[PDB]
Design a protein around this ligand. Structure first.
Ligand code: ATP
Ligand code: ATP
Ligand code: MG
Ligand code: MG
Lengths: 275, 298, 298, 258
């Protein structure tokens, strides 16, 4: 609807800001470094085994991408209010939820085009310069990785919108965004694991594998590691649930469901924002 | 039948800001809101927009509820401290705003020329000055087909030429049948271009009506600056005993205050005794009306 | 004496905003910067300070380089579009600015009650309105001894009574010898308090001097207004043929504009047959001077 | 000097905002997490031993505290310029340098107070909740306070460096990840690859000094001495020099902001 107009202005902001260059340049540096400069932790300097890169790169992405999305989106709502342009925009015939979805689609297209551009330099970087990779497996693996990364970007965007609608000032918005970032990666894993190890020696064995759905950062990791990838041996945390949360579309539906509930939460909070 | 307000009372936290503010406007009438700095001019406009929902009052905006975006389709609003995105081009900013409002791309450049900003267009809003940003806001207001146009303190920043050009624009838009709610603090120069006026102090609405009825009920006396009419004290003692206030400045000048209501015949005698060096007669001005009504509230 | 703008000009990247500005003011000299919307008034006002560096020439302030913290200590600035941290209350903001400025911390409360924000304190700037925000900016401007005050567009957003009080405060400060570089665009009524007025358009400072001096440098007609006095045609035929420029308005009145020198002998005719149902005498004010200077020289 | 006024201004900003309850409680939740829930991999239990919970705590500190710094001082300069309040402050008798120094001191006291309150709550939790294993924590946790605070200050100064050049707050964050990205990922990975490229010819005498060129490496060396070519005193002095040169560059860039 008029949603496309707001998404268009957000994309225009993306070009007029070093963001689109910065997100794509650094994300491509991530991707290329893991393939050639990466694997040097073992001393074997350069190789591009597709199963490795899409897993180490996957973990570095599950850390980087939520933070990038939060930095992009935390000031979408609070930033406009502080700027003084939010009150003007509501005067236009635009629904509060309509502008919220417009901002969401704008930032989401920013990060999606960004990841596509960044790996597009990467995808050629492997294919042309590597020696004898089966291009088909590379293509479908990085395809799942691109779509998973952009979907995680969208879900953390939605989290940024909900926290921004809750907050009153830019700095407090950044603080809550940092808290939400730290919570999922470092705490939803640690507390949950600790939960099995001591709270659950025999307290309730059956529940722990499924709860990993709540955290999108875990869902993302399981989606990108398990895959059709061969030699699929999962270490701690993932191995519980690597074997069977019964999926192959269930995780994708759950991630989309998180984005959905978060967008509804943002629409609800932003509707009651003023006064 | 443009805005119909049914005794709205608005509360901000525990502080009431408006109480039983019942106001109305015609479809083609122009109503000048005036009041104290902390009364409620902007908040009332914000209620009209539909930014806030009145706790006690059902406002009708363009014969419809203000929540509906169909009202905002043909309604334009110019905000005070109109701040814009500071890294968008003025032409680009106004084109984006038109894209939001649906107006044709042919209108944008012609309207930028009309306001008087096309010469400095294509440069980012940050470079603009307090004036050009005000002119960009005014361009935003006139964007599209505005049936109802809400201006907030709108002459802030503009030139006297720009102010009078905007005044002629408002008069023309009244001729075209559009509805204007103009609030301003420069009372000089708005008496001619404003049909109906309203004065509100604190929350209660002090009065409302066109200039004629508002002037008549007050019966505000006329002020006459003079300097050397006939002598230093010739004209003073003929009015001090006549029950009229007249303070005589030491520099051979007498300032008499007439009523201008019924003694219009006495105006012939006022300037007919001796040849005067300098006379400056100021009729009861709507700014003096504002001062009078503020002295009524308090 | 205090602010010596001698031989300067300023350019952004490729555009020359200020061209050959020479402005000299002294202690207790109420100067004014009037001009078209975007003529360099503010960029020059900022040039008075250390915010902008002069591309050509130098700008002496208090006899020292304006970049020295010493120079800014004896100075005050009210910027157009005054913007304040909108989360901490007005009391907090005034205390903070005074702490950077240097105050007894008791002048803060005196100013806050003096400017009429006493009730509004503690409420926070976001909840403040455009006026109270401008009042708080003015209250900040009056912290300390303002040897060199720089109030820019200060009258925007204020009540007519509030702007009258601000002009009275300008008069009081002019009594105790504190410079004020006024720049307000509200034209009516400033000229009385303006010691020296300077109308600069986009090109340069094509006009500088006192209002009485400027009025002399240029012949301006006097303004006479009427509204339905005797008839529509008799006045026209009587005054057009008698060697005068009679502006024949169509609202049943012929407002005749004199040369501003014949009026002294014209009044005898006015008392003769011209019954005073409505007579307005307005000397060529600062509006007329501004239009004259802008159009003829710009 | 009188930068103290700005320092208390952002101190009040931190207390009024939700940082202090979200930065100190940030450390509080993780520190107790690393100290009792941090051995959950094989046996959930607590306070295994002071130098154990310190190593993981420092490892996560490298990842997160720089990031907190870059998220506290990107809008510090450019944000005021967007708000239009920076220029009014620059009218005052302060000057370019004192504004930056005052904001740096205020934000540094914010980080220092957060570290003290949060890791101190964690330390008193270690003392009370767990057995009297040892109390002379003071050297380990106190050195952790000082090292984490100085790392926060150096990345705060980097954030001031990047902010004073960007013109739109949104773009400031983009160049904020870059500084965070270079020290966290790029430096270690590129250094390791360069060592692998030069098989035996890298001249290992100058590797420890190349480690100095990364504040994260300096901070990890500092909390790894429980019982190296680079003295501990020099290992501090180098981080202090990083702070000094970063603030010098931030002041230099700020002077030509407009
Ligand atoms: N930083 C800047 N970069 C480029 N152009 C600028 C900059 N600041 C101001 N300008 C432009 O310089 C010209 C002069 O600005 P000026 O000082 O007249 O503003 P002003 O006096 O506030 O205008 P007014 O008072 O009439 O609103 C305008 O075209 C303005 O847009
Ligand atoms: N968001 C808000 N929260 C609390 N109070 C508010 C809010 N917005 C406005 N107010 C209150 O409304 C009044 C100021 O708004 P008002 O409409 O009176 O401004 P105004 O009269 O237009 O001011 P000016 O004409 O000087 O610009 C004050 O009582 C102020 O506290
Ligand atoms: Mg207002
Ligand atoms: Mg200006």
């Amino acid at each position: 609807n008029q949603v496309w107009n707001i998404a268009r202005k957000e994309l225009s902001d993306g070009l007029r800001n070093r963001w689109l260059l910065a997100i794509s340049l650094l994300f491509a540096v991530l991707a290329v470094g893991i393939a050639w400069l990466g694997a040097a932790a073992s001393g074997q300097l350069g190789f591009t085994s597709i199963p490795a890169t899409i897993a180490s790169l996957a973990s570095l992405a599950t850390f980087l991408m939520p933070l990038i999305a939060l930095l992009l989106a935390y000031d979408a709502i609070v930033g406009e209010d502080e700027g003084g342009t939010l009150m003007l925009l509501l005067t236009y015939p635009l629904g509060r939820g309509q502008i919220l979805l417009g901002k969401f689609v704008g930032h989401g297209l920013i990060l999606a085009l960004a990841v596509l551009i960044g790996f597009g330099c990467a995808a050629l970087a492997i294919a042309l310069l590597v020696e004898g990779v089966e291009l088909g497996m590379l293509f479908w693996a990085f395809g799942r990785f691109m779509i998973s990364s952009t979907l995680l970007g969208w879900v953390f965007l939605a989290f940024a919108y909900v926290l921004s609608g809750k907050v009153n000032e830019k700095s407090s918005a950044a603080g809550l965004a940092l808290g939400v970032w730290f919570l999922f990666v470092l705490v939803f894993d640690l507390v949950l694991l600790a939960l099995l190890v001591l709270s659950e020696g025999k307290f309730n064995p059956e529940l722990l594998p499924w709860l990993l759905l709540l955290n999108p950062t875990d869902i993302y990791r399981l989606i990108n590691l398990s895959g059709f990838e061969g030699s699929g041996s999962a270490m701690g945390v993932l191995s519980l649930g690597a074997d069977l949360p019964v999926p192959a579309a269930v995780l994708w539906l759950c991630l989309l469901a998180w984005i959905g509930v978060s967008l509804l939460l943002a629409y609800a909070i932003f509707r009651r924002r003023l006064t | 039948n443009a805005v119909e307000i049914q005794g709205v009372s608005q509360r901000y936290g525990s502080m009431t800001v408006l109480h039983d503010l019942n106001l109305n406007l015609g479809e083609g009438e122009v109503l000048g809101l005036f009041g104290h700095n902390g009364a409620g001019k902007t908040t009332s406009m914000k209620l009209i927009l539909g930014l806030l929902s009145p706790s006690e009052g059902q406002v009708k905006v363009l014969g419809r509820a203000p929540n509906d975006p169909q009202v905002r389709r043909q309604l334009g609003y110019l905000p005070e401290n109109v701040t814009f995105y500071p890294q968008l081009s003025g032409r680009e900013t106004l084109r984006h705003f038109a894209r939001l409002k649906g107006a044709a791309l042919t209108q944008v450049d012609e309207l930028l020329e009309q306001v008087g900003l096309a010469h400095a267009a294509d440069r980012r809003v940050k470079t603009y000055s307090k004036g050009m940003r005000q002119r960009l806001g005014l361009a935003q207001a006139l964007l599209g087909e505005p049936r109802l146009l809400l201006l907030d303190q709108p002459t802030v920043g503009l030139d006297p030429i720009a102010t009078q050009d905007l005044y002629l624009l408002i008069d023309r838009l009244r001729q075209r049948g559009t509805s204007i709610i103009l609030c301003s603090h420069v009372l000089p120069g708005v008496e001619a271009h404003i049909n109906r006026a309203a004065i509100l102090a604190k929350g209660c609405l002090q009065a409302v009506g066109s200039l004629s009825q508002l002037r008549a009920e007050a019966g505000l006396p006329v002020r006459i600056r003079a300097s050397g009419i006939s002598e230093r004290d010739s004209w003073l003692q003929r009015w001090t005993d006549a029950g009229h206030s007249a303070r005589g400045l030491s520099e051979s000048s007498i300032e008499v205050v007439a009523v201008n209501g019924h003694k219009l015949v006495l105006l012939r005698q006022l300037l007919g005794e001796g040849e005067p060096e300098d006379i400056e007669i100021h009729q009861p001005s709507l700014e003096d009306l504002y001062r009078y009504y503020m002295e009524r509230a308090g």
